[PDB]
Structure formats: C-alpha cells, structure tokens
Amino acid sequence: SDPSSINGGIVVAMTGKDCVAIACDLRLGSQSLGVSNKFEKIFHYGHVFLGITGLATDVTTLNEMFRYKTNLYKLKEERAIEPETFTQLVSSSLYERRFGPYFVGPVVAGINSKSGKPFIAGFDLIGCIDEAKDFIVSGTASDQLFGMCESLYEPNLEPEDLFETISQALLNAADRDALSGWGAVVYIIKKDEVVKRYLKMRQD
C-alpha cells in the first residue's frame, strides 16, 4: 500500500458514439481486510455521473461536498449543470487544499443535452483537466487499466457493443488488483435514460 490509496477501488470511463459508460468494483478494503461488498464508488448529481477512487474517507466526504455545490447551482439557475462545466468545478475543490490535500482520483462521465456529445475527464490529487476523450481510468489498477482499455479500444462502438467492451476490461483487471476484486456495477448512459446493470462475477 501507499498513503493515498490503502482502501483502493477502481473506476473506468470510456467513450462510444454518442454514449458514455462508466463502471466500478464495489469492494472496499482496509489494508488486507475486505470490509463491504456493497458500497458504490460512483455517485451522481442530475445527469452527470462521477466515480471517486482513493482513500475511502475522502470519497465519502466529496460525495457530500459535491452535492452541496451542485444543488446550489441547480436551484439558482433553474437548470442542470452540464458535464463540460462540471469539470472545472472538481478542479477548483481539489486545488483549494493543495496543502493537506484530498486523496482521490475522480473520473467524470456524462453526455450533454445541448450537444449530445460524450464528455469524460480525470483529475489527480490537487486536480487537473485531463481532457482526453480516448478513455480515462484512475484507481489502484490505473496501470493495469490503461493497457487493457487501449487493446480493446475501437472508437465509435454502438452502445450495446460498448457494454461488452467496458465490462470485459474491468473484469480482467479486478482479479489481478489486490485492493478491489468484489462486485461490479456498470452504468450504460445514453441521452434518453440511464440503465444501471450490476454484473455477476467472482469473489476472491
């Protein structure tokens, strides 16, 4: 282990043609002890989905913090935040406390209702826009994911082919990740609706 990611967790975001997906494992760990099988990494505010990897206490704290920040916006402008705009909001929350900083790697996923265009982003510890629209992965299996994703990646798969491609990438990676191995939930996100599908997979 490392001090910024003792409690693990993995999130993977891809782009398809006018669709995104995002998926995560559901294992929480604390050192070598696997604690809970149900505990989601990904949370959402309106129509933008966010996974937050890292030291587990800060995932929970920013889940709450972002909800407070998003909802202040929504009520005031009378309209949903968009996943282009939402990028720079993560970047400022993370940078406010550069000294003593949040230990997370959040990954956005989402599709605009003003372009119909998939937007994914990654951020580090004190935050950055990593504005690739290749595919964006974070977590303890960061190394593992960048290769598995790359191999499979063909741009502009149909949504239901995209579900095959991200679920497979995630499952292989997880078996070989020490601090995640249990459960999975995959979000297949479209403009119209958002379908959530839990996998069935091995436990360790």
Binding site: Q144, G147, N172
Partner: protein, 222 residues
C-alpha cells in the same frame, strides 16, 4: 554513497503455446529520461530450444545470462551432448539467482520453450530465486498493462456464452503460432501508447522444432 542497483527498463512477454512457445521484448534501453539504445535485443538464444530473457537492470541480467551460458557447456562435456530440458534449466537458473541472494539481483527472468512432450511451456522467475510454471507472464515495467489482456485472449477468463445470460463460460481454443504472433504485437502496441519505456522495436523469438526464428517489428518512438 555508491548505490549498486539501477534500472534500464523494458518490458518482456512470454506466452505458452499448445505446441510452440514465444518469448519477446521491446528493444528500448533507457537511463533516467534518456534512451540509451533503440535496437538492442533482451531475448538471447542459448541452445537446446531455450531462449532466455533477463529484463530489468542490465548489469544484473547480463551477469546472470553469462552464468547460464557456461552451464550448457559443462552439460555437454560431462553429460555427453544431451538435451538440457527447459524444466531442468529452470532449477539450474534458480541456483544462479540464489548463489548470491545476500546481494540480490533485480531482473525478471522468463525462459520459454518446449518440454520433452513438445508442449509449449513458459517458466517465470522472481529476482531472488523462485520460479513456477506459468501459462502467461509479462515481465518488466509495462507488465501491469499487458497482463489482463493476456488472460482474456489466451486463457479466455471472464468470458461467457451468448444466450445464457452469462452463466456458462466460453471454452478454451487451441492456438496457432501465427495467432500468438499477432496477439503479441498488439500487447506491445498498447504499451507503446500508454507506457513510456516501450517502443523503438520488438524482437519476437519463436522456438519451434523447425528451428529458432527471429522476427522484427518496429514500434513507435512516441
């Protein structure tokens, strides 16, 4: 303060066939944030269908390699020109790592070849000694990248049968030497893209009973 150890980089990949075995590796050598060489093989032929790659910090990997190469010659003089088997070679190499574990080597060694039944076999090492027979191993810095993809496409794990709701696995499919050569390439392509110590070239040795082949593919310098 002198420090013995370093890092000279690389990624290597052995895959075990049904009747063949392959051991490969990118041709990049690095020091810090330079590129030392853009064409130097990591994978060496040592004879009796045994190809040896000792990837990592080279000072440790080249010394190990010279040790094993002496082993084959005294195997010929005293044991009268017999086939040094890949399983038995694995023991012999273990003792060479272990001959100084007080001063431990830092290379990930993979040997690849046939057994005495003619079935592809890859046996893979830890720097301080131990080995075990694998089906697939990635050595080196981009090993983490390459590996989950290997289980997907050669071991067929995490994959299922259509029209069952994914409750019956996709079964095993025997391989070809061509099939693996294509798949190998893909691994080192993905790595060029998403890891920084992989590029320049690729050297694939193919150890069959039709001799030992060399095949070269360029990779990018990105």
């Amino acid at each position: 303060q002198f420090n013995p150890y370093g890092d000279n980089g690389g990624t290597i990949l052995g895959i075990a066939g049904e009747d063949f075995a392959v051991l490969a590796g990118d041709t990049r050598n690095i020091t810090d944030y330079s590129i030392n060489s853009r064409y130097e093989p990591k994978v060496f032929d040592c004879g009796d269908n045994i190809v040896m790659s000792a990837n990592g910090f080279a000072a440790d990997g080249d010394a190990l390699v010279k040790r094993f190469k002496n082993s084959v010659k005294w195997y010929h003089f005293d044991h009268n020109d017999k086939k040094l088997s890949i399983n038995s070679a694995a023991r012999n190499i273990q003792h060479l790592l272990y001959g100084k574990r007080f001063f431990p080597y830092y290379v990930h060694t993979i040997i690849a070849g046939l057994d005495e039944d003619g079935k592809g076999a890859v046996y893979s090492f830890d720097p301080v000694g131990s080995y075990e027979r694998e089906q697939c191993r990635a050595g080196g810095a981009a090993a983490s990248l390459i590996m989950p993809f290997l289980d997907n496409q050669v071991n067929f794990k995490n994959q299922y049968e259509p029209g069952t709701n994914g409750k019956v696995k996709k079964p095993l499919k025997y391989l070809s030497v061509e099939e693996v050569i294509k798949l190998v390439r893909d691994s080192f392509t993905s790595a060029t893209e998403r890891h920084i110590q992989v590029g320049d070239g690729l050297e694939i040795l193919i150890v069959t009973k039709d001799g030992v082949r060399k095949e070269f593919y360029e990779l990018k310098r990105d």
